[PDB]
Design a protein around this ligand. Structure first.
Ligand SMILES: CC(C)n1cc2cc(Nc3cc(=O)n(Cc4ncn(C)n4)c(=O)n3Cc3cc(F)c(F)cc3F)c(Cl)cc2n1
Ligand SMILES: CC(C)n1cc2cc(Nc3cc(=O)n(Cc4ncn(C)n4)c(=O)n3Cc3cc(F)c(F)cc3F)c(Cl)cc2n1
Lengths: 302, 302
């Protein structure tokens, strides 16, 4: 197909990555104005990591225990606090590369760009989606803790994810920039399982709209459905139910193609019930669920 | 610990993107030190684009016919020349964000990051490969002309691609930074086909090693093959030959996984002859060929 996982240009975020070290424990942090944000796990020694008491651990730290570096350049820490699972270190220098920014908490299905970093040095950028079980299928090595995920709209970086940990199945878990985990996970080095995942229905529908835009439309039928009936069927096939917000974000694709959202729902319901019977959509037998309606419009229309 | 198409961080290149305008024709340029590089197609009017005589068109221009804009700042052009299909505009100010850089010509099968840009403004970043038929399967829209492809090694940006055009099939053609096309194409608005494409065998093997590293092993078998006998089958299926150099560069991945290169070849041979019978590898329903061995080593080990 002519669709790629495309990331946002990463330069605005690259200019904000720093390294934070407490003793020998080291990870990545995010320097915006005169504050550095990073996972509070940095304050753990190896022996603390299993079952940390973060209040007690933080109480015994002072500003002079935190080594924050921009490249090789040390930034002096002049205050510290903890908000949920994020440490906030106030530094004596406002980052001159700070972009316009927001902190946002995203829903499952939403996509974002990840800047994978090691020792405060950006290494790679890629797009990924928040799964319905609140994990991401990222690509992260040891030392990636504190890498961030983001979108860029207008000229403003919306930070939505800070990476904390790998789960036993190789998927990834983390927090928003206010330190609240996505999903039921905790920041301790214990085995935590993600729940069973489901397919992101709103994104599958966006993919079907993308196929229509490109002239691949064999799956359009003469039926419609109600949203409630569709949701009840979807859940029988391990598909997420649609929300009212999902119907709304499909609006532009519906308008562009002239296909009502609930008619697309009826078409997807036929595919769930009957399978693709050997046919392909956009050259594939698999339905893509990590392109949002906004991703589709970006790549089709710019 | 996950496998994604990962691009280089784009910030070093973002700082070099400008807009170039000649008359009403406009596209993207690359500002390094005191020179702006862009496709010479920019000197064409609408009527010229169908069948341009570029040396004629260029002698009919002066420095003041070129408008170069870097954000809200106009750069004064104080000289111009052509190098093959690349226009070089000397400006009166050096770019302070110029990275350390080189111009390189890549080989089919090699990968690079693309920074897609519109009207001099970076819009997205993604990884792609130079196809054996010297096209690229990019994500590019109208106005992307002059976007660049690059790799980053240490702190040095190696520019390898400058985007020119989309072919009727929806794939893309462009030049190196010395203005030579990859492939049999010309910078004329006329329908151009590429040669028949093949699959990049060494890259498929690298990606199968990535699959094994990430625990996806169903396709392994215990057949063995010689390099020659694998190559006879590969060529039958429109796969590129595997050379001894290819075998050598897969060595690190062979060592890591304990799977001899020719044992992986025997696995690939079976996949070509039998298909993947509805199964996936690393979530893909088809054999992926846009990851090089180095790509896999970098993403799976650092
Ligand atoms: C001795 C010094 C140098 N030192 C050791 C450290 C170990 C740490 N623990 C983690 C680091 C990390 O990068 N990741 C992310 C990840 N993504 C994919 N892979 C494979 N790894 C982790 O998951 N962890 C474990 C972990 C991190 C948490 F934030 C958490 F709440 C629980 C965890 F189990 C770290 Cl962070 C620093 C180290 N420094
Ligand atoms: C403002 C007005 C006066 N104006 C119109 C222009 C048209 C131009 N022509 C192209 C622009 C472009 O971005 N792309 C790349 C691309 N990638 C995917 N898509 C769908 N399009 C093109 O392929 N072209 C066509 C094209 C470009 C060449 F460099 C070439 F040698 C032959 C071509 F047919 C341009 Cl470049 C500027 C324009 N300005």
């Amino acid at each position: 197909s002519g669709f790629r996982k495309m990331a946002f240009p990463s330069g605005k975020v690259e200019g904000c990555m720093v390294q934070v070290t407490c003793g020998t424990t080291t990870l990545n942090g995010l320097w915006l104005d005169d504050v550095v944000y990073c996972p509070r796990h940095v304050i753990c020694t190896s022996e603390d990591m299993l079952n940390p008491n973060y209040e007690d651990l933080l109480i015994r730290k002072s500003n002079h225990n935190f080594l924050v570096q921009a490249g090789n350049v040390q930034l002096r820490v002049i205050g510290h606090s903890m908000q949920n699972c994020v440490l906030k270190l106030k530094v004596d220098t406002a980052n001159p590369k700070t972009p316009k920014y927001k902190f946002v908490r995203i829903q499952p299905g939403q996509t974002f760009s990840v800047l994978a970093c090691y020792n405060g040095s950006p290494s790679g950028v890629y797009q990924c989606a928040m799964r319905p079980n609140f994990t991401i299928k990222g690509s992260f090595l040891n030392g990636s803790c504190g890498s961030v995920g983001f979108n860029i709209d207008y000229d403003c970086v919306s930070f939505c994810y800070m990476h904390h940990m790998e789960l036993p199945t190789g998927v990834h878990a983390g927090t928003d920039l206010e330190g609240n985990f996505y999903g039921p996970f905790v920041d301790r080095q214990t085995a935590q399982a993600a729940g069973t995942d489901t397919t992101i229905t709103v994104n599958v529908l966006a993919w079907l709209y993308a196929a229509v835009i490109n002239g691949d439309r064999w799956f359009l039928n003469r039926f419609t459905t109600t949203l409630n009936d569709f949701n009840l069927v979807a859940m029988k096939y391990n598909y997420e139910p649609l929300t009212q917000d999902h119907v709304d974000i499909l609006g532009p694709l519906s308008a562009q193609t002239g296909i009502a959202v609930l008619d697309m729902c009826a078409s997807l319901k036929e595919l769930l019930q009957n399978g693709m019977n050997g046919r392909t959509i956009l050259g594939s037998a698999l339905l893509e669920d990590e392109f949002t309606p906004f991703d589709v419009v970006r790549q089709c229309s710019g």
